Amino acid sequence: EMVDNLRGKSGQGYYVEMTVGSPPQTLNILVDTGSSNFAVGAAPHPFLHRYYQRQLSSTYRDLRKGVYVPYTQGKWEGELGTDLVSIPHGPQVTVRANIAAITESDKFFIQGSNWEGILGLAYAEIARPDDSLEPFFDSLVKQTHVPNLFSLQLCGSVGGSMIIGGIDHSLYTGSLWYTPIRREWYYEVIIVRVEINGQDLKMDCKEYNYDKSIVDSGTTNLRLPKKVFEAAVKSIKAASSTEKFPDGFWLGEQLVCWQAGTTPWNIFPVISLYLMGEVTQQSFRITILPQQYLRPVEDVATSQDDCYKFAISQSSTGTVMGAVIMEGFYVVFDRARKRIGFAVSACHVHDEFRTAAVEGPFVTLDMEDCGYN
Numbered sequence: 001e002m003v004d005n006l007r008g009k010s011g012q013g014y015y016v017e018m019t020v021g022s023p024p025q026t027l028n029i030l031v032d033t034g035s036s037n038f039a040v041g042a043a044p045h046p047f048l049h050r051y052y053q054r055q056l057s058s059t060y061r062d063l064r065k066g067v068y069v070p071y072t073q074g075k076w077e078g079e080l081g082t083d084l085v086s087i088p089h090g091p092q093v094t095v096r097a098n099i100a101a102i103t104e105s106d107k108f109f110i111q112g113s114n115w116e117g118i119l120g121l122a123y124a125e126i127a128r129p130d131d132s133l134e135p136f137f138d139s140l141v142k143q144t145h146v147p148n149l150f151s152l153q154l155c156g157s158v159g160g161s162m163i164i165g166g167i168d169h170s171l172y173t174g175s176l177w178y179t180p181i182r183r184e185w186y187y188e189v190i191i192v193r194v195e196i197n198g199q200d201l202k203m204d205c206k207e208y209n210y211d212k213s214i215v216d217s218g219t220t221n222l223r224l225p226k227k228v229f230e231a232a233v234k235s236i237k238a239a240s241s242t243e244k245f246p247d248g249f250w251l252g253e254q255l256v257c258w259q260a261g262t263t264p265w266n267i268f269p270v271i272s273l274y275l276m277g278e279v280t281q282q283s284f285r286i287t288i289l290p291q292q293y294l295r296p297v298e299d300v301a302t303s304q305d306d307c308y309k310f311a312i313s314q315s316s317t318g319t320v321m322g323a324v325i326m327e328g329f330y331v332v333f334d335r336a337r338k339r340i341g342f343a344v345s346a347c348h349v350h351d352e353f354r355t356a357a358v359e360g361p362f363v364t365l366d367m368e369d370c371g372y373n
């Protein structure tokens with residue numbers, strides 16, 4: 001009954017239904033493995049259809065402390081408190097958890113997204129104001145008998161599943177491959193190799209993880225360090241050279257459009273990210289199709305065409321494997337064993353020539369550690 005409990009709109013995140021307070025107030029909550037605060041709109045805002053009303057909850061407790069959280073995109077401030085929380089289409093339990101009541105925000109809420117709050121699923125180490133503010137999933141595990149693991153199946157209006165406490169085999173095919181969580185703050189992992197169109201980018205592998213690499217359902221794009229981004233774009237340009245696009249496209253400042261139904265998928269390369277394995281100098285790869293990294297932009301005005309935004313962009317805060325990367329994979333956040341699993345999802349991307357894949361093992365003769373720090 002947990003399958004298909006996620007909804008979303010492209011580029012705007014995936015959300016799950018939750019209740020806060022007693023009697024229960026229903027809100028849609030964006031699932032974010034790239035942060036660690038649970039926060040809900042708690043005052044009127046132009047883009048909020050509804051919000052948490054603390055005065056109506058008999059079980060609300062004010063912690064008498066403010067909190068400020070900035071993201072790559074957007075920021076908010078609010079008041080800390082605790083209340084009862086449940087997940088109607090998740091585990092049938094109720095927990096008392098920390099909740100930030102958002103009272104002011106800037107470029108955070110998105111017009112028409114259908115969500116009113118955010119569930120930070122990463123570790124206490126990056127919670128604000130500090131790591132003494134226990135994250136929701138930690139509270140869930142402590143207070144209920146739920147196993148310390150969740151999995152995400154994000155599918156390319158969109159949908160998907162969040163499975164809490166276990167792995168649902170009906171949601172993937174083939175083998176699950178695991179990469180170590182290097183440090184429990186973000187879900188930090190290590191990329192050891194990048195290929196585009198089957199060709200190694202041939203960088204010192206530390207470059208791929210400058211200054212960290214993370215798996216982040218709350219960020220849309222694959223975000224890459226400048227040096228890696230520049231090399232990736234050059235390689236994608238070369239592979240797709242039968243067509244020439246404006247510089248603005250590669251920078252995410254312009255859409256590219258084709259007459260409806262004629263998108264030339266085949267001229268765009270597959271991208272392989274090799275992730276550190278559980279054994280010394282072994283790795284596996286996840287392979288991404290252009291259907292993932294060219295993100296569709298829905299707009300009735302443009303609808304004689306299909307139009308896309310380039311969903312790979314540059315970062316100065318490390319590599320972010322965002323939603324377009326996670327799409328079509330079943331991703332297991334195995335907190336209990338400090339590892340992340342990847343398998344091909346039941347909604348995996350494929351056409352008649354190519355398919356997304358998770359493959360291994362691969363061996364490297366180089367003994368260098370690819371972690372940047």
Ligand SMILES: CCNc1cc(C(=O)N[C@@H](Cc2ccccc2)[C@H](O)CN[C@H]2CCCc3ccccc32)cc(N2CCCCS2(=O)=O)c1
Binds near residue numbers: 035071109218220313
């Ligand atoms: C879904 C909305 N789209 C985007 C969202 C974000 C983004 O910052 N995601 C937040 C969650 C969040 C924030 C605001 C609204 C919804 C969710 C996440 O939490 C970051 N994790 C961590 C990532 C590392 C840095 C960081 C710093 C501080 C907190 C968290 C993080 C980055 C994007 N991109 C930037 C803009 C251009 C496209 S992009 O490249 O996809 C696009």
Ligand SMILES: CCNc1cc(C(=O)N[C@@H](Cc2ccccc2)[C@H](O)CN[C@H]2CCCc3ccccc32)cc(N2CCCCS2(=O)=O)c1
Binds near residue numbers: 267353354355356357
């Ligand atoms: C019958 C087609 N079969 C496949 C084709 C490709 C693929 O992208 N081929 C690259 C070279 C390349 C890339 C990566 C690794 C080695 C070589 C070439 O650049 C084709 N360009 C185009 C040339 C014109 C015709 C064409 C037709 C169809 C696709 C691409 C092209 C990948 C496939 N698998 C690789 C392993 C992972 C799953 S997969 O991605 O499905 C299966």
